[model samples]
Target chain A: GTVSRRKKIAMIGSGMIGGTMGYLCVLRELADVVLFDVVTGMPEGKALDDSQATSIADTNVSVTSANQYEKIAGSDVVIITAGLTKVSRNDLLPFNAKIIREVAQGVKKYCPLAFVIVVTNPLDCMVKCFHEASGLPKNMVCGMANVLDSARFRRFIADQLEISPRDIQATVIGTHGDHMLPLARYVTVNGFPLREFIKKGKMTEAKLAEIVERTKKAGGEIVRLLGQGSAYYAPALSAITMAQAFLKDEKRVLPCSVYCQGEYGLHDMFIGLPAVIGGGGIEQVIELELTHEEQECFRKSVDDVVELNKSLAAL
Target chain B: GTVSRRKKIAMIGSGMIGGTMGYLCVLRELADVVLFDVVTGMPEGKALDDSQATSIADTNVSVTSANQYEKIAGSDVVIITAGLTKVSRNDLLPFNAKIIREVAQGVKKYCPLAFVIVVTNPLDCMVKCFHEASGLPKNMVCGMANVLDSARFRRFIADQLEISPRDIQATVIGTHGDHMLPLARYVTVNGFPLREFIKKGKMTEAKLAEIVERTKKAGGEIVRLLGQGSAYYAPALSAITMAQAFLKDEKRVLPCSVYCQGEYGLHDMFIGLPAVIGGGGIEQVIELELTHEEQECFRKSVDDVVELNKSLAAL
Candidate 1:
């Protein structure tokens, strides 16, 4: 009997984001899922819950739970979301770096060729740690923050303009934190410059600036609203979009956190930048001409990420 | 300002299954969602969480929560999942029927023309009550069960045959519960008769019987495994598929618990049967020629449903 294996995606954390990512992958039938978690019954319970949904989706894919990294040996994609939270900003780096380093070793030994997506906090630095520790090419490893940030930006724009977010084309680059840059000049709605909305009195510059600030703080707002846990649905969906691009070989140009070498005049750092994602992983990095003000903000964002990376050296 | 409104879907519960169904609707952009719950913050938090995911999904739709039934006004579709669980089977009927009656009043007053899907337990009876109370045409209201049951059947077959469940076509008819009937003769794998595998020694009658029994008990198995919630992911996904068919006007043939006038010799009652679902809701109920054994089992299933409906009169 000849049997062909399905594409496999290993989710290295079966918490909220990781579990949701695995569920979405199964629901879309993008790949077979291996949910790896250190917790005793977390991944197993989630897999069982997700496995029952496959039939309803008309999808043919296995969703299995694993406590051992060996189960992820032949994976095509490995998404890491394992890290601690509820700590101060400075404490988040070292705690997550230790967890990411162990995860990086597992991926390094098991699925060396897999396209890796890092979703841990301190996005730019965590992705850098994973890439440096795992020995995978920079192109094959990236963090999921800019896609989520850009989504929040587009959503806010849609809310303010009372238009469909699907019609909005916006990009956020540089860092994933407070220094993240929202390129206002490049923003468009239905191929019309968003600045036209301001010119037409539909919106104002002050409103756009406020929307940008809200986008930067969207994650914290959700955490405060829920009174526990950060946003997971959008974050997981953002990572899945990147994973789908690779799985189906769709060359989707998405803003993501990737190691940059002389792109946007930044070198030796992982920052949010626009890149074409496909089966070959990060097929091409797109460079956009930025206005003088945009360049100044971009440079500050890079500096902040660089400052954050300095803490990584102590680990 | 001339702007067209998106189609609206009202979720009348916002529990695990209801929340998940709304999330899937937003993820698919099937329609703008109104998540209605009696609870104060549950639906609001879920809507906010799901709203944030829309941009990541590239979906342009609104997800709002409501404590008042007025928010569900002008909805295009309404899905009800508000009912009490963890009660004895006998007690479940009256307890849920009371809740469904209140919901029916809301839907009747609010979105009278909306296609309503009932997911409350005692599904057959609850749907009947809603249809009677709402004064909607029988074709506009139905229950979701057989799609999920058939999915479980197809999944089990795929597990045994080592083939993609996507390639397997299976139908489950009759009741949604223990009395439900799985029509073995209608089961096909990639357009080939599933029985051929049995004839060729790939499966056996005893094994197939066991699988059918398991399908009937699959829901219970998950409830026991989770030790808290009944299966929500598959149930929610199943309802979403049916809702999508209606929202997109896709004439999809699915097995659902719907009112039957003359189909399958059942009359004036809701039962699991194949139907063409589209913009017109349950467009047509299909009748398949059943073997003697299947017919006998189906009659027994109908008898069970008839007995269950007797309790609805008391409500």
Candidate 2:
């Protein structure tokens, strides 16, 4: 197919993350957007509000809304943020799994060739469910987890070092949950390894541990402060960053949850790892040698995701 | 005077427009931001949320919030979107005037050197009020009106021509209100004059007039659809566009409401015209020859603004 036509993005939810991502896509002139939601009139209202801003944003893309799956027919990218958030972990999996199954059916019926990004919670299991249900190419389906986790990790590091986050290069792997692994040894600031700062006494190992712990709890901290809703702005932008890479064929190396096949002694499961994302989606999974301590932590996260996948089987 | 330090932007309102603009500024890595609002805790919460997204945006910037004016000290640019909205036009002017006056005092005391962009309604008068109350230089303070108006005009034209808004160049002059001028003769798509489209029968003059009329009512159309607060996303982005020009010294030519010193046969008032915005603020006002019909319409807008200014004196 010729790349003459403008691209279209289908947002599978129109809540905070979905709406903001759609707006950002238009602002960046990445693609035209269709905001889809189950809630009647909600996505429509948001689409109207976002469309009016396009003039000021200097983009020619149209932003439309629909409650029907048919509106998403020709989308090049379909981002699923369509699930309920609840307090209990037990209730979250099966409940959200049902939602993801339906959403997958919609994508399977329309835009099966689209690059799919799942932002639903229990992200590892959700991505697995989406892959199985949609029956799409594994390379074209992934979950937004480590990218957001790495962003939070980088933010904490930049705060500790009193430097620009732009100067930092960091990654998180394993699961998206509490057991996720942040590799301090691989972290660099302005091409200098983070350990050099500790060697120079500008940072300490104890402080580095605290920053990692804080990064792990960053989402919960914001949830407590806001009194409602998890962090959306960073999560939305993180997904867009990944989307931009695929749409523009930037081939950016980003930490994302993708189907892994024996790369890290893991098999037939979706997990977070650094992968090259491009127009073809998850082009290559970058393997990093882990330290003994890092490997132990990674094993724990892998076990947790394996357990989560079992719950998906029962559902 | 050293340019080594990062630029700082102080947002004076911290409402919808203020918060969104601060986020965009940080996302673009244009400057560090201080979100100031009269209400307690609101700006702080917004700042916290926005700050967490900085790493995802790949920008090295801080977003902090304050209720006190002192927090805005050393700001390079200050934006005011703090004002009340009401059903009646008569009640809006003086009420928002009083709020703008207090805001002006804050900017005057804390960051008098900052280039100020006013986004309050009754924009022409509020801009004048801020200038008089704050005692800032004429070039350093202006209102966000026609830039937004021009954006709307350009968007409508782009929609009509079935092309990208990025390829459309349109401008609206005169007032920021009902009497604002959308110059059809000056609009071009891909360097081809809009009038030429009409001449070649690709577009009709009647359709052009309809687009102009729609541009004038664009704000209210969104207001009615939203059934709540006025449009914020585009308005926020519009102010940021102007702010970006000054901080980056881009010297972008945009339509803005700046102090007129015998330009356009008007004197001692801030009105909409095409002006070059750069490091020196309103560096130059670009004057265009107006047709007899254009001047007549321009005069009516001038008369409305002059009438509005008279109301400011009584307050």
Candidate 3:
């Protein structure tokens, strides 16, 4: 694709996740930002006190704020960090369904044509809610789940086997919650296979399972320590990773919770799976082979989201 | 200062300004953000989507969005880009006065203890308004007027002289409006005085005055061409530049519009003047000894702002 020199991003909230992301966006030169929030002071404070360093650091990203929905009308990419989520990253369908529904509707209303990357919690369900509520092509609406899961997966394995996180490649499939799967069997430690790395470390399958369990609970652990919030650093990074692929039209294949037509032995469900994310959001979904037990776990998570979809028929 | 490794940016609006800042914050890794927009999706889209680019660019900055006032409770710096200044930069007092009140109430509500950098239009008046509305200490708020104005000053001067823009150092001050002061006396062409260069080129002062006139109308010209919108690239770059100073705590001095506390022979008014911006926002306000006529002109501008401050009498 021919590159478009001028790109604009519209941020839908200015809360914790928005605030954290705003600081980084000013630092980066990817695009100029328009911060929108209902609360008045957030954007004003960011411009005066927080952004002074960028001039000397010599960053080129311009940042401004607006409280109106009209400000985001012409955006190329619109990120939805609106609504509340369970900081523990558990099954949050019951509490967050209404919040996600309203947020997704606003995303559709404001920048309907713009690509929407959902970062709401109980990731699998939020993406599903945004897609269904917005009716934007399902592909245009995806959640920031898999990357964080993969990062956690890789981080755990890297710590366990004494390897750099960069050297480890892993994928966590299913929902981004307790039942999420961090497959060591499919992961590679550096150029070596997962089995080889595990062999070298003398880590048994049971030990590996323990590490995966910890990876699953990373969100919960953080929330437990820092009450009323979850991890913004990693989650924001994961979402932006997906967004850059779509914004720059890189056609990069990264795992996310996206709607699948028939892949992964699933249909019509937004679940955690690998896909090519580009200008049009999700380009294609990739089906991964799973062990029988793993497939069963994935099936259950998908079913849970499906059930939630039906229960929230009002949404 | 022991140089804390943070660019603390507090965004007043999460709608677009707060959201977009979050996008670039992670893109550049210059700072962290406290994104507060009353609307929900504004910050969510920012923190999640923008933070992802770090996986590729390797810049690690976090963004968090908050709906409550407390999310950005104690930001080191703030950037206010929210509210509408429909009054046009030309109206100076009334237009910016209205927006300043709206945005400042929010900034003070959330980040009362922040260094403010204002980017709203009628920039001179808004800078003063945010300071007063925020009820913060003196020099806590600065306008993004001269930073962008200086860039345009540099560009216009180079274009007129038919030389590389990089070879010129031009400073644009005053209101960041039609009455902006482009001090050619302070500017140099390739390390040589502009007066010397102009005399050597046989260019008359009348020709230079015409160029300054062009600089004054630049923002209006763009607004006319874009229709209710203006250039994003330059404005965004100016905001980011300021963020870098705060994030890295760089003691970089630049021309900015801030509240004058008896500097430049003016008090209780905000106008474009030189300031030493570091991690703490305006580390030191720089007062320049201007030609008698120039000082008179500056005093007139300050007097204009003092009149504009009357709009706040309702508070």
Candidate 4:
């Protein structure tokens, strides 16, 4: 349906994640990039740096940096990556929520039809706030976490199995945070489920637990290593991968945080689920029949997101 | 004619450019990457960081690092991005030549048939050193400079024309260094030659001369701005583009410093020329019918490369 000369992707934050996102956009030659940030000169500097790379990349994707919200007009996909903070855990919700709200308002005013990807922390809540604030269609908004979360899980499993992550299709869903539900039953390596392929002798249950825990905390580990900044390389790639599906109409069934309308018995809130991403944005939400344990985790994740929204009511 | 499980690309000298090359190799899912470096922990750390990104990149391309050169075995394309240094200008020949020779010997030992992409400084001489040292087919070795230089030229043309660089095809050949020749007559914007497109209104010969000079010094501009590294993004990308041409068998005629025999009156020399790259590296070095002035410049580039090789005779 889209016959535009160029697909435009707008980034709302021009920090490490945002900058890398812009860089990847050019690297992949996916779309023209518009990087927006509140900080003076940060987005401009990064955009110019990225522009300098075009001489070698041989791609014509234009990258522009701006402080004005109106500059996001005509974006096919708007990715918000600017609201991460060292704010105390208690203050994270209100701080990031307000930023995403303002960003959502901008998207609504300029690129109302754009597919919005939320990368701000507390992703499930931030995406909910954005979708509500922007008043975009339920399917038009989602948060970037499950693809990243599942990627982490798949990587850990690949490390354990001594196999390629490409062959191991791992699906992590439910929530963006600690309450996330990683479906071991659905995990497959070269089309063989991990449950059947991986016996306890090769990897004990305790080892598996450790791997899962590490997957959940992969972000914190990198933070500890860097002593500054959370993970951006993988996060940016994950966002770009999601945006690619929409831009190219690839129709990849990727996991994302979206407003669930009675899927997996979860309703009226943003939660991680496997959904088809294409030109129509959340084209279809794939509802997998969860096992008992997976269903339990999923329900708990739903409740956690619900509780966060309740907490937001007070804020 | 050939079948393999997967294409493997090995990066020699995992410095900034090499690391970025490996990162991009995985990002593009082009091939399995083997990053070799003399430093014990550097390659490993970079490879691990790149591997960590596999989850987000959604690519199964294996990236491994080693201090030993033999780890480059089975690589389809090996890129050398090392040996640029504070080596006194007078000592450039002996210093970089020795490094490329050692790297070439490693390639000879590990992957004799691999297409070698040379990114070391003093590219024309470096590729010559690599070809002579490795004793591989002359066509298998080419330096990465012309593509990058042409990319810069095309980008400048796009800026002046206010069109996309993708639509502008620019050609820079003869040499990889300052003595290189940029063919304005061959440059075209979507099949329209630049000579005819811009007559006297916008960019005069003097103004165009400034753009060409800037194109030649694009790396210096970025280096001056950054005050450190000399343009890795575009350089890495140009190498990757060439490598892709070979790996994918996409017989694209990209300009590169390839060995020339009886082409443009050059014999037994590795200098910049328009060459078709595909499954067979340097499939054909296209002999362009250059204008008399262009031919004169190309011959001069050949002489400069010959002089560098003469200086290397001392080594």
What DockQ do the predictions score, one after another? Answer: 0.01, 0.01, 0.01, 0.01
Task: List model 3 lDDT by residue over B1-315, tens digit each.
Answer: 747666467776665545666666777776777676667675766766666666676677777776676667667667777665463454545555666686677667866767777887666767767776678877567888787877887787766654445445677778755567877666654333466556655356887887778887887888899886566667766776776665566555567887776777677788888666666667766555578998776766666666556664544
In candidate 1, which residue ranges exceed 4 Å CA deviation? A1-315
Encode model 1's per-residue lDDT on A1-315: one tens digit a residue: 639778899999999998899889878888999889999997999999899899888778899999898899989999989888667454589889999999999999999999999988788889988988989998899988889998999899877765546546678888866788987776765334566568767689999999999988998899999998889999999999999888877666678988888888777779888776789888767666667887888888888788878989876
How many backbone overlaps does candidate 2 show? 0
lDDT of each: 0.84, 0.84, 0.69, 0.80
Instruction: Write out the backbone clash pairs for model 1.
Output: none
lDDT of 3: 0.69
Give stretches of model 4 more than 4 Å off. Answer: A1-4, A88-90, B1-315
Question: Which 10 residues in a row give candidate 4 chain A its minimum summed lDDT?
Answer: A189-198
- Runs of candidate 3 with Cα error greater than 4 angstroms are A1-5, A47-50, A86-95, B1-315
Q: Scored by Cα lDDT, where does model 2 land?
A: 0.84
User: Which of 1 and 3 is ahead in lDDT?
Assistant: 1
Query: Which of the two, 2 or 4, has more lDDT?
Result: 2
True contacts kept of each: 0.00, 0.00, 0.00, 0.00
TM-score of each: 0.52, 0.52, 0.48, 0.52
lDDT, candidate 3, A87-128, per-residue tens: 344456666777677666666787788788777666677777
CAPRI quality level assigned to candidate 1 from its DockQ score: incorrect
When just chain B is superposed on the true chain B, each candidate scores a TM-score of 0.97, 0.96, 0.85, 0.95
Residue range B1-315, candidate 2, lDDT tens digits: 966888999998999999999889878998999999888889999999899889887678999999999999999999999888664443578888998899898989989999999988788888888999999999999999898898899788766765446546688988755688998777764333466567766579899989989998998899899998888899999999999889877666678889998888888889888777888898867566678998999998899788888999888
Q: C-alpha displacement of A34 in model 4, angstroms?
A: 1.1
Task: Report the TM-score of the second chain of model 2 against its true counterpart.
Answer: 0.96
